[PDB]
Every structure is written in structure tokens, then in C-alpha cells.
Amino acid sequence: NSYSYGWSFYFGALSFIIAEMVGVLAVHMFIDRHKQLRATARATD
Amino acid sequence: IDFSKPFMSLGISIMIKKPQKSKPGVFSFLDPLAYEIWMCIVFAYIGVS
Ligand SMILES: NS(=O)(=O)c1cc2c(cc1Cl)N[C@H]([C@H]1C[C@H]3C=C[C@@H]1C3)NS2(=O)=O
């Protein structure tokens, strides 16, 4: 009744961590863009 | 020799020196939950955050 998960199982699990990291990095780019866009707009005002 | 009917029931069996009871592992505090739950809690922790 014993079992052991293989490398393929650990590839999907490892994909989840990388995907979440990319999501954080993608949101941080969206945040930085708008911050730069607002900073420039304020300076022109 | 002319045997008779079995008066009792037996069967080959392995005898080993009774291995003394073991000490709960150093990480026994993870026993209450299966390894799958601990793995998924980490995923949930990352996903929620
Ligand atoms: N349970 S046991 O091993 O004590 C046990 C086992 C057995 C007993 C009697 C006892 Cl008490 N008798 C039977 C016997 C009764 C009739 C049916 C099978 C033989 C002829 N053989 S057995 O099935 O080998």
C-alpha cells in the first residue's frame, strides 16, 4: 500500500512556485510603470 | 505409515527477535498530518500571500 511521487509530480509542484514568482514580478512591473508615469505627470504639472 | 485426520491446524511462520519499541522521530510533530497536506499548506501559504 506504499507509494512514492516521481519527478513528474515534482515538476508541476515546482512550476507552481515559479509561476507565482513570475506573477509577483509581473505585478511589480505594473506597479513600477504607473509610479514612473505618475511621477513624470506630477513633475510636468 | 497410515496417518489420521488433522487434530489441529498449523502453518510455517517466521520467528524474529522482537525489535524493541522505537522512539518517535525527531520530527514527530509532523505526524498528525500526511505529507501531502504539509506540501499543500505550503502551496496555499504562497498562493494566498
Ligand atoms: N483451531 S485448531 O487449530 O485448534 C483445530 C483445527 C482443526 C480441528 C480442531 C481444532 Cl481444535 N479439527 C479438524 C478436523 C475435524 C474434521 C474436519 C476437519 C478435520 C476432520 N481439523 S483442523 O481444521 O485442522
CSV table of C-alpha atoms in Angstrom, one decimal, chain A residues 23-38:
chain,number,residue,atom,x,y,z
A,23,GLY,CA,3.2,36.8,-11.1
A,24,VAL,CA,4.8,38.9,-8.3
A,25,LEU,CA,7.4,40.2,-10.7
A,26,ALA,CA,4.7,41.0,-13.3
A,27,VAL,CA,2.6,42.9,-10.8
A,28,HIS,CA,5.7,44.7,-9.6
A,29,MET,CA,6.4,45.9,-13.2
A,30,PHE,CA,2.8,47.2,-13.5
A,31,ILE,CA,3.3,49.0,-10.1
A,32,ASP,CA,6.6,50.5,-11.1
A,33,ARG,CA,5.3,51.6,-14.5
A,34,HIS,CA,2.4,53.6,-13.1
A,35,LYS,CA,4.7,55.1,-10.4
A,36,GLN,CA,7.0,56.4,-13.0
A,37,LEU,CA,4.1,57.6,-15.1
A,38,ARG,CA,2.6,59.4,-12.2
